[PDB]
Amino acid sequence: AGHMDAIKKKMQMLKLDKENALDRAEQAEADKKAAEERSKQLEDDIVQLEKQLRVTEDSRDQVLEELHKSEDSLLFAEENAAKAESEVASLNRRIQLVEEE
Amino acid sequence: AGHMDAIKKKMQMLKLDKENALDRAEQAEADKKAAEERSKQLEDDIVQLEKQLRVTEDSRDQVLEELHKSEDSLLFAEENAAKAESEVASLNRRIQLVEEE
Numbered sequence: 001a002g003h004m005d006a007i008k009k010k011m012q013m014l015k016l017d018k019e020n021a022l023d024r025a026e027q028a029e030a031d032k033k034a035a036e037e038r039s040k041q042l043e044d045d046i047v048q049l050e051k052q053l054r055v056t057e058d059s060r061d062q063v064l065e066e067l068h069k070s071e072d073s074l075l076f077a078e079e080n081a082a083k084a085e086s087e088v089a090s091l092n093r094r095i096q097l098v099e100e101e
Numbered sequence: 102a103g104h105m106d107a108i109k110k111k112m113q114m115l116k117l118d119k120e121n122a123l124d125r126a127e128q129a130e131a132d133k134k135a136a137e138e139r140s141k142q143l144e145d146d147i148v149q150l151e152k153q154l155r156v157t158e159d160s161r162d163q164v165l166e167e168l169h170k171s172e173d174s175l176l177f178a179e180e181n182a183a184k185a186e187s188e189v190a191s192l193n194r195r196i197q198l199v200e201e202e
Contacts, residue, residue, distance in 0.1 A: 007200065007202055010199050014195055014196045017192050018193070018196070021188040021192060024184075024185040024188075025182060025186060025189065027181075028181040028184075028185055029178075031177075032175060032178040034174075035172075035175035035178055038171045039171045039172055042164055042165075045168075049164065050161070052157055053154070053158070053161070060147060060151070060154070063146045063150065064143075067143040067146075067147070070136055070139045073132070074133060074140060077129050077132035077136055080125070081129035081130055081133060083129075084123075084126035084129055085126060087125075088122045088123060091122060092119070094115055095119070098108060098111050098112050101108055
Protein backbone atom coordinates (compact mmCIF):
# COMPACT_ATOMS: atom_id res chain seq x y z
CA ALA A 1 0.00 0.00 0.00
CA GLY A 2 1.69 3.16 -1.28
CA HIS A 3 1.95 6.59 0.34
CA MET A 4 -1.01 7.43 -1.88
CA ASP A 5 -2.87 4.25 -0.84
CA ALA A 6 -2.98 5.54 2.72
CA ILE A 7 -4.12 9.01 1.63
CA LYS A 8 -6.72 7.31 -0.50
CA LYS A 9 -7.98 5.38 2.57
CA LYS A 10 -8.32 8.51 4.68
CA MET A 11 -10.10 10.53 1.96
CA GLN A 12 -12.56 7.66 1.79
CA MET A 13 -13.27 7.76 5.52
CA LEU A 14 -13.68 11.53 5.37
CA LYS A 15 -16.02 11.25 2.39
CA LEU A 16 -18.07 8.80 4.44
CA ASP A 17 -18.31 11.41 7.28
CA LYS A 18 -19.30 14.08 4.76
CA GLU A 19 -22.03 11.88 3.24
CA ASN A 20 -23.51 11.58 6.72
CA ALA A 21 -23.25 15.35 7.33
CA LEU A 22 -25.01 15.78 3.96
CA ASP A 23 -27.76 13.35 5.00
CA ARG A 24 -28.27 15.51 8.10
CA ALA A 25 -28.42 18.70 6.03
CA GLU A 26 -31.13 17.08 3.87
CA GLN A 27 -33.14 16.01 6.90
CA ALA A 28 -32.91 19.54 8.35
CA GLU A 29 -33.96 21.12 5.05
CA ALA A 30 -36.89 18.72 4.91
CA ASP A 31 -37.72 19.62 8.53
CA LYS A 32 -37.75 23.33 7.63
CA LYS A 33 -40.33 22.77 4.91
CA ALA A 34 -42.47 20.50 7.07
CA ALA A 35 -42.52 23.23 9.75
CA GLU A 36 -43.22 26.05 7.28
CA GLU A 37 -46.03 24.03 5.71
CA ARG A 38 -47.58 23.38 9.12
CA SER A 39 -47.14 26.97 10.35
CA LYS A 40 -49.10 27.98 7.22
CA GLN A 41 -51.76 25.36 7.92
CA LEU A 42 -52.26 26.67 11.44
CA GLU A 43 -52.17 30.35 10.54
CA ASP A 44 -55.15 29.68 8.29
CA ASP A 45 -56.71 27.72 11.13
CA ILE A 46 -56.77 30.87 13.22
CA VAL A 47 -58.08 32.93 10.33
CA GLN A 48 -60.99 30.48 10.18
CA LEU A 49 -61.47 30.72 13.94
CA GLU A 50 -61.32 34.52 13.93
CA LYS A 51 -64.14 34.51 11.36
CA GLN A 52 -66.07 31.94 13.35
CA LEU A 53 -65.69 34.18 16.41
CA ARG A 54 -67.08 37.16 14.48
CA VAL A 55 -70.07 35.06 13.47
CA THR A 56 -70.91 33.85 16.95
CA GLU A 57 -70.56 37.51 17.97
CA ASP A 58 -73.01 38.80 15.36
CA SER A 59 -75.35 35.95 16.30
CA ARG A 60 -75.09 37.08 19.92
CA ASP A 61 -75.67 40.72 18.98
CA GLN A 62 -78.85 39.43 17.30
CA VAL A 63 -80.28 37.71 20.40
CA LEU A 64 -79.49 40.99 22.18
CA GLU A 65 -81.61 42.90 19.65
CA GLU A 66 -84.52 40.51 20.25
CA LEU A 67 -83.93 40.93 23.96
CA HIS A 68 -84.22 44.70 23.59
CA LYS A 69 -87.45 44.41 21.62
CA SER A 70 -88.80 42.14 24.36
CA GLU A 71 -87.85 44.51 27.15
CA ASP A 72 -89.65 47.20 25.15
CA SER A 73 -92.71 44.93 24.83
CA LEU A 74 -92.66 44.55 28.63
CA LEU A 75 -92.57 48.31 29.30
CA PHE A 76 -95.40 48.93 26.84
CA ALA A 77 -97.41 46.23 28.60
CA GLU A 78 -96.80 47.96 31.94
CA GLU A 79 -97.91 51.28 30.42
CA ASN A 80 -101.07 49.61 29.08
CA ALA A 81 -101.77 47.91 32.42
CA ALA A 82 -101.67 51.27 34.25
CA LYS A 83 -103.80 52.92 31.54
CA ALA A 84 -106.54 50.27 31.90
CA GLU A 85 -106.37 50.38 35.71
CA SER A 86 -106.90 54.12 35.50
CA GLU A 87 -109.89 53.66 33.16
CA VAL A 88 -111.48 51.13 35.56
CA ALA A 89 -111.09 53.57 38.49
CA SER A 90 -112.65 56.32 36.36
CA LEU A 91 -115.64 54.11 35.48
CA ASN A 92 -116.09 53.08 39.10
CA ARG A 93 -116.31 56.78 40.12
CA ARG A 94 -118.82 57.35 37.32
CA ILE A 95 -121.06 54.38 38.33
CA GLN A 96 -120.96 55.60 41.90
CA LEU A 97 -122.09 59.10 40.82
CA VAL A 98 -124.76 57.68 38.51
CA GLU A 99 -126.21 55.49 41.26
CA GLU A 100 -126.55 58.64 43.43
CA GLU A 101 -128.68 60.55 40.89
CA ALA B 102 -139.67 53.33 33.24
CA GLY B 103 -139.05 54.92 36.64
CA HIS B 104 -136.40 57.44 37.68
CA MET B 105 -134.53 54.37 38.91
CA ASP B 106 -135.12 52.52 35.62
CA ALA B 107 -133.09 55.17 33.81
CA ILE B 108 -130.31 55.06 36.41
CA LYS B 109 -130.37 51.31 36.10
CA LYS B 110 -129.91 51.61 32.31
CA LYS B 111 -126.91 53.92 32.63
CA MET B 112 -125.18 51.80 35.30
CA GLN B 113 -125.54 48.91 32.89
CA MET B 114 -123.86 50.78 30.05
CA LEU B 115 -121.07 51.88 32.38
CA LYS B 116 -120.61 48.34 33.64
CA LEU B 117 -120.27 47.26 30.02
CA ASP B 118 -117.48 49.89 29.52
CA LYS B 119 -115.78 48.69 32.70
CA GLU B 120 -115.90 45.03 31.60
CA ASN B 121 -114.06 46.08 28.45
CA ALA B 122 -111.49 48.10 30.43
CA LEU B 123 -111.04 44.98 32.60
CA ASP B 124 -110.53 42.81 29.50
CA ARG B 125 -107.79 45.23 28.45
CA ALA B 126 -106.15 45.09 31.88
CA GLU B 127 -106.09 41.28 31.62
CA GLN B 128 -104.56 41.38 28.15
CA ALA B 129 -101.87 43.81 29.37
CA GLU B 130 -101.10 41.67 32.41
CA ALA B 131 -100.82 38.65 30.13
CA ASP B 132 -98.55 40.69 27.83
CA LYS B 133 -96.29 41.56 30.77
CA LYS B 134 -95.77 37.90 31.60
CA ALA B 135 -95.22 36.90 27.98
CA ALA B 136 -92.52 39.60 27.74
CA GLU B 137 -90.89 38.69 31.06
CA GLU B 138 -90.85 35.02 30.08
CA ARG B 139 -89.23 35.83 26.75
CA SER B 140 -86.71 38.30 28.22
CA LYS B 141 -85.67 35.41 30.52
CA GLN B 142 -85.45 33.02 27.58
CA LEU B 143 -83.15 35.38 25.69
CA GLU B 144 -80.99 36.32 28.66
CA ASP B 145 -80.15 32.63 28.97
CA ASP B 146 -79.56 32.57 25.22
CA ILE B 147 -76.75 35.06 25.65
CA VAL B 148 -75.36 33.18 28.62
CA GLN B 149 -75.12 30.16 26.32
CA LEU B 150 -73.49 32.26 23.61
CA GLU B 151 -71.02 33.85 26.03
CA LYS B 152 -69.92 30.33 27.03
CA GLN B 153 -69.77 29.25 23.40
CA LEU B 154 -67.57 32.28 22.71
CA ARG B 155 -65.21 31.30 25.52
CA VAL B 156 -64.94 27.83 24.04
CA THR B 157 -64.14 28.95 20.52
CA GLU B 158 -61.58 31.25 22.16
CA ASP B 159 -59.86 28.46 24.11
CA SER B 160 -59.95 26.35 20.95
CA ARG B 161 -58.25 29.22 19.12
CA ASP B 162 -55.68 29.66 21.88
CA GLN B 163 -54.94 25.95 21.32
CA VAL B 164 -54.21 26.24 17.59
CA LEU B 165 -51.97 29.17 18.58
CA GLU B 166 -50.02 26.90 20.95
CA GLU B 167 -49.52 24.36 18.15
CA LEU B 168 -48.50 27.23 15.91
CA HIS B 169 -45.86 28.28 18.44
CA LYS B 170 -44.50 24.74 18.69
CA SER B 171 -44.30 24.65 14.89
CA GLU B 172 -42.48 27.96 14.64
CA ASP B 173 -40.07 26.53 17.21
CA SER B 174 -39.66 23.37 15.11
CA LEU B 175 -38.79 25.62 12.14
CA LEU B 176 -36.10 27.57 14.02
CA PHE B 177 -34.53 24.36 15.32
CA ALA B 178 -34.49 23.04 11.76
CA GLU B 179 -32.70 26.20 10.61
CA GLU B 180 -30.17 25.80 13.44
CA ASN B 181 -29.60 22.17 12.41
CA ALA B 182 -29.27 23.11 8.73
CA ALA B 183 -26.50 25.63 9.52
CA LYS B 184 -24.78 23.14 11.87
CA ALA B 185 -24.64 20.47 9.12
CA GLU B 186 -23.52 22.99 6.49
CA SER B 187 -20.69 23.96 8.81
CA GLU B 188 -19.71 20.30 9.31
CA VAL B 189 -19.64 19.72 5.52
CA ALA B 190 -17.35 22.76 5.03
CA SER B 191 -15.09 21.46 7.81
CA LEU B 192 -14.86 18.01 6.16
CA ASN B 193 -14.15 19.56 2.77
CA ARG B 194 -11.20 21.49 4.27
CA ARG B 195 -9.98 18.27 5.88
CA ILE B 196 -10.18 16.22 2.63
CA GLN B 197 -8.34 18.98 0.83
CA LEU B 198 -5.54 18.90 3.45
CA VAL B 199 -5.41 15.10 3.43
CA GLU B 200 -5.10 14.97 -0.36
CA GLU B 201 -2.08 17.32 -0.07
CA GLU B 202 -0.13 15.04 2.30
